[PDB]
Each structure stands twice: as structure tokens, then as C-alpha cells.
């Protein structure tokens, strides 16, 4: 049983993007509570090779635990298995890699979150209208599950049609371009889903322009996460609903379960559904993460 101060854990986001600041906060809080050494290790891009290199270094340093949010699941399966054969405890959070041999996944039930968005939209549109889906990186499991949940849920509504599903790699400028093109192609668009953190900010940015201002109030917009721009969009009426995950709680649990596994008292890991809050203007101050 390692002395807490000799315990070393590392937490890896998909990249330095806004959502993961909360995961860092929650992990750092839990590590400090636990008295262990903690590092936040950030990829430079979303590709995959970049996260393999990080795990090899961590192997090299005989660190005790690794928690990772995975950009693309297949890429990282091989190096995560070696880490485990070196005694390193490994788990995922936010975005899973199910065949990496990781002990457990901590995060949202992403297909169910999509399903919930679909019900919200279907009710809001009275089962009628063209809709578009804006995603981030096309290889992301959690994002693709969200999309699958939306499409399966919308199948209940014959009068709704998904006319567009497009990615952005969560580049805001790319998101703006995509949203601009969508609105031009579909003047009778009735709804938009943003299943990654950029979708809300991009839709609000585009709707708040001279060219598209008249679309304000015409569309039902549902977005993911609670980035300040998204909250401002919800405040301003450009966004009608969001889905808020529990990123702080993910980071906290990630460290706590790493420590428990490292110290040999995690009897049989099990996935944790950290849950997701449907947030509108009416409850936007009282949700937690
Ligand atoms: O919605 C979140 C997602 O859970 C995470 O994986 O990437 C950042 C945001 O897109
Ligand atoms: Cl953004």
C-alpha cells in the first residue's frame, strides 16, 4: 500500500478545450484531498498518436494511475494494455475506449442523453420540422452515441426529418461556417442540435448577426455543456435548452477511483453514470456538475 505522497496520478483530457477545465478542477480537488501527486497532461490535437505518446511517458515514469478521455478509441487500445501489464491502473472518463482493458468508465450515458434531446425537440416542435445535428470530431464515441440517440429517438416522430449531420472538430470558426451553410440551405429549418460544446456558441454567434438575426425565435436550439457562451445564448434566447454533464464530478471520481485501485481496495470496478441535467432559462443557476 503506497504512502499517499508517493502516489502519482495523471489525468488526460481530449485536448486543452473549455469543457475539460472542470474535469481538471474536480480531479485536482480530489487529488489534494487525497494527498497524492497529480498531473494534468494535455494533448495538442485530437488525433490519437498524440495520446499514445503521453501514456508511454507515464509508463516510463512508473506513475501509478492514468485517467483519460479518449478522442478515438481504437488508437489507444494497445498502449493502455501495456500500462496495465506494468501495474498502472487505468480508467476512462467522459469518452470511453471499451476495448483498452480499462478498469471502468466514468461519464455520461451518451446515447441516453441523445434520446432525451430527441424527446425534448419532438415535444417542442409538436412532432413537425426539419432539423440539423452539429457535432465535433467525427471519431468521438461519446459524440457519435449522442447522435445515434437523437436519430433513434426522432424515429418516433414521422413529421420530423434530419436534413443535415455535420462535424466541426469543435473549431468555433468551423462551427460558424457550418451553421451559416445550414441556415442558408434550409430556410424552413425548425431545429438544431449541438451535441458537442461548440454547437451552442456557434449557433448563438451566427444568430446574432445581421444576415441571420430574423431567425431568432424561429428555431428550437438544443446544445451541450454549459460554457459561458452557451449560458449567454440561453440567457439571450438564442438557445432554448442545454444538456449539462457532470465534468467536475467525473474528474473527482476519476482520481478517487484511481487512488482506490492503486491502494488495492476497489473491489471489482464498475462503470459510473454521472448523469446529465436538462437546463433551460428557468433552472440555469441551480444545476451542478
Ligand atoms: O460535450 C463535451 C464532450 O463530453 C467532451 O468529450 O468533449 C467536449 C465537449 O464536446
Ligand atoms: Cl467554443
Features:
monomer; alpha/beta; Rossmann fold; 2 domains; 6-stranded mixed sheet; 39% helix; elongated; binds alpha-D-arabinopyranose; binds chloride ion
Classify the secondary structure makeup into a structural class.
alpha/beta
Tally of alpha and pi helices:
9
CATH architect. name of the largest domain? 3-Layer(aba) Sandwich
Q: Output the CATH topology of the largest domain.
A: Rossmann fold
Order of helices and strands: EHEHEHEEHEHEHEHEHEHEE
List the ligand species.
Answer: alpha-D-arabinopyranose, chloride ion
How many domains in all?
A: 2
Oligomer: monomer
- Global morphology: elongated
Please describe what this structure looks like.
With 289 residues, the protein is an alpha/beta fold. It folds into two domains: 2-108 and 245-275, Response regulator (Rossmann fold, 3-Layer(aba) Sandwich), CATH 3.40.50.2300; 109-244 and 276-289, Response regulator (Rossmann fold). It has helices spanning 20-34, 49-60, 77-85, 110-124, 141-154, 172-185, 199-207, 228-236, 247-262; strands at residues 8-12, 37-40, 65-68, 89-93, 105-107, 128-134, 159-166, 189-194, 220-224, 241-244, 272-273, 277-279. The strands form two sheets. It has a six-stranded parallel β-sheet, with helices on both faces. Strand 6, helix 5 (141-154) and strand 7 (159-166) form a beta-alpha-beta unit. Helix 1 runs parallel beside helix 9 (247-262) and helix 6 (172-185) packs across helix 7. The structure holds alpha-D-arabinopyranose (64K) and chloride ion. Alpha-D-arabinopyranose binds next to loops. This is Periplasmic binding protein/LacI transcriptional regulator. Keywords: Signal. One of its GO terms (molecular function) is carbohydrate binding.
